[PDB]
Structure 1
């Protein structure tokens, strides 16, 4: 029954993981990490989460199942973070949040829900976008199309081509947006562009789907939410897939949420039930631990205070490295202009290196990066910055 099963493709990034971890050269740097790392080159567990965990340890009395949609406090804390503490969506109760196993889980339950309960057949994804997008939607039967986004020359948001390609999209098509810290580019629409996008969106009848995995990594928790809120003020319906994987350093506890927004409570409840049936046909109910840690931190003043400090510390280090990167390259010197680096947000951005350049960077220097030239800024430390830039300069 499985003898003619064709092997799945070499993971588009994980190959680097293994390849890298096979280099006896210890001056090696992996910039294709896809996860945050501190100046020690470590992905630690936040101090706030450890405290949250001793708390759960001392207070949990049962591991009994959570409801299909997870811990309730977790849902409210997430919609407050997304739409803001006093938002009308919240008061009018037109948003329902389901806790899910990471942001990918949120994206697949949306996909399944949308595919079994609506007429949507295609999903517009930016080109480029976080990889796993295509597989998730296709696996649910949604056709994926791509809209323009990135300007190779100016290393910028090609808004014109963007709004120009989105015009092929019909009413009822789902259009996927990264809320902040666009991956892999690091370019985000400015608030005005978010507002025009919202307006065009309402006019064309797009169903917006927000992938919000980096809240707090661009400017702050509230600022990062402005684009989504720009849409939420405009739309009757939207879906948001959030992840706490990164802003809480809870990668492996699979904590995320899929929030549905409809015109009124009555329709959101009706649509949510089918989203619940989609959850029940998949993994049944979600993993309590990670979501539990988030809910206790966000609901505790002292713990939330420490976390936010931890998040800004992370945000700032990423900002420091982009900054230190740009001028250490201008110190090691080469006809360049990696200044767009400083204007980009989040952990990733396209270095602008060609596949041959990244190749010799790996093979000849021990610097590992994705073939697309994508580079993870959090992989740089004040200590590995110099050799990094030397290698970078030696291949330009």
Structure 2
């Protein structure tokens, strides 16, 4: 009997992982990694938030059991998530039109959403932005859903090409899913204005798309409430919505896998039937979600003083990111960049497309020890007042 595994073809190697290895082995003292995928503070660390440490001590001191949570996780975490997303006092919440399952990260929410749709609806196609967040295609394809891309970013001119966006969406059919990033578009940082969100929401009602909002950076854009405006514009207009949310970045809980899939339907009965089937999708997967991270979030948000410490931490991160965005543009100019990079100050979150070609990216690594990903995506949280000048000199030298 030949082995069942004997003829398996290896998955292609992950280029970013190979880059990370190369960086680790790089002995040049001037190296800088702009290709990283998480937040980093001014010292180049990704620390545990003090609010999180305090919450963890509280749990250490007060938790008396690890017995299984239900399929939908910690109820208080679901309530806190819904309040963050829709606002406390939302008619949506009051009308009991929303149900939330705590999931292993926003990624887990996306997969749960995909399995639920594939098994319980006629959805056959999910639309994502160009450029896309690479993991979306893998997740949706895995449930048998086709993924198509709509027009979004004008890379030559560094804008969200809104007219191209809405025209390209004419190809989306009633009952297709259309996925939008809630704020801090990953990887461009280019977000719809509120007026644009309202136009998209109206169009979605007219065409009959089911909107899916991926929101993993609430609070990194302009603020907690402002970053939810687009989601809330959709929520005001639609009978139905799916939200895949994450606390990986805004609570710095990446590896604890804390997020949620929220369903919204026309009425309480409908969301309840749908939610019963989403629970079935969970039962066939990882069964119930990991408690530690969600418990931390609930513990922070439920307590006035702790919540205050966390919101200041979040504000700190957002403002450091905005500072590096401004310092990057100003230093490029100072170093005599032969181009305008103002689009950087107009973009939200830690990621932007630098507009560098793959050849310039390669040159940046080999010659200058400045690491970005092949697409030219840079993480501005990889920048500091101390590494900014040489990094920008390098970029100018490559233009």
Normalising by structure 2, what TM-score? Answer: 0.98
Task: Measure the CA separation in 2 of the matches of 1:85 and 1:306.
Answer: 20
Task: Measure the CA separation in 2 of the matches of 1:342 and 1:51.
Answer: 34
How much has 1:58 moved relative to structure 2?
0.1
1:17-42, Cα deviation, whole Å (9 max, x unpaired): 12211101121111010100000000
Task: Measure the CA separation in 1 of the matches of 2:15 and 2:116.
Answer: 27
Aligned twin of 1:273: 276
Task: Measure the CA separation in 2 of the matches of 1:113 and 1:211.
Answer: 16
1:146-181, Cα deviation, whole Å (9 max, x unpaired): 000001222001111101111001000000000000
Moved over 6 A (4+): none
How much has 1:13 moved relative to structure 2?
2.3
Q: Mark the CA change 1:88 to 1:320 in structure 2 (over 3 Å): closer, same or farther.
A: same
Aligned twin of 1:159: 162
Aligned twin of 1:45: 48
Counterpart contact for 1:148–1:161, Cα < 8 Å: yes
Task: Measure the CA separation in 1 of the matches of 2:30 and 2:63.
Answer: 45
Task: Tell me how large the CA RMSD over aligned residues is.
Answer: 0.6
Structure 2: state its 5+ residue gaps: none
Q: Mark the CA change 1:274 to 1:372 in structure 2 (over 3 Å): closer, same or farther.
A: same
1:270-329, Cα deviation, whole Å (9 max, x unpaired): 100100010010000000000000010011100000000000000000000010000011
Counterpart contact for 1:177–1:209, Cα < 8 Å: yes
Task: Measure the CA separation in 2 of the matches of 1:332 and 1:4.
Answer: 54
Counterpart contact for 1:122–1:144, Cα < 8 Å: yes
Q: Mark the CA change 1:255 to 1:109 in structure 2 (over 3 Å): closer, same or farther.
A: same
1:324-380, Cα deviation, whole Å (9 max, x unpaired): 000011111121111100000000000000000000001111111011100000000
How much has 1:9 moved relative to structure 2?
1.5
Aligned twin of 2:90: 87
Counterpart contact for 1:30–1:379, Cα < 8 Å: yes
Counterpart contact for 2:31–2:368, Cα < 8 Å: yes
Q: What's the secondary structure of 2:214's corresponding residue?
A: strand
Aligned twin of 1:15: 18
Aligned length: 395
Counterpart contact for 2:365–2:371, Cα < 8 Å: yes
User: Which of 32, 35, 40 is matched with 1:32 structurally?
Assistant: 35
1:224-270, Cα deviation, whole Å (9 max, x unpaired): 00000000000000000000000000000000000000011111111
Counterpart contact for 2:132–2:149, Cα < 8 Å: no
Task: Measure the CA separation in 1 of the matches of 2:31 and 2:336.
Answer: 21
Task: Measure the CA separation in 2 of the matches of 1:9 and 1:227.
Answer: 37
1:119-159, Cα deviation, whole Å (9 max, x unpaired): 00000010112110100000011000000000122200111
How much has 1:75 moved relative to structure 2?
0.2
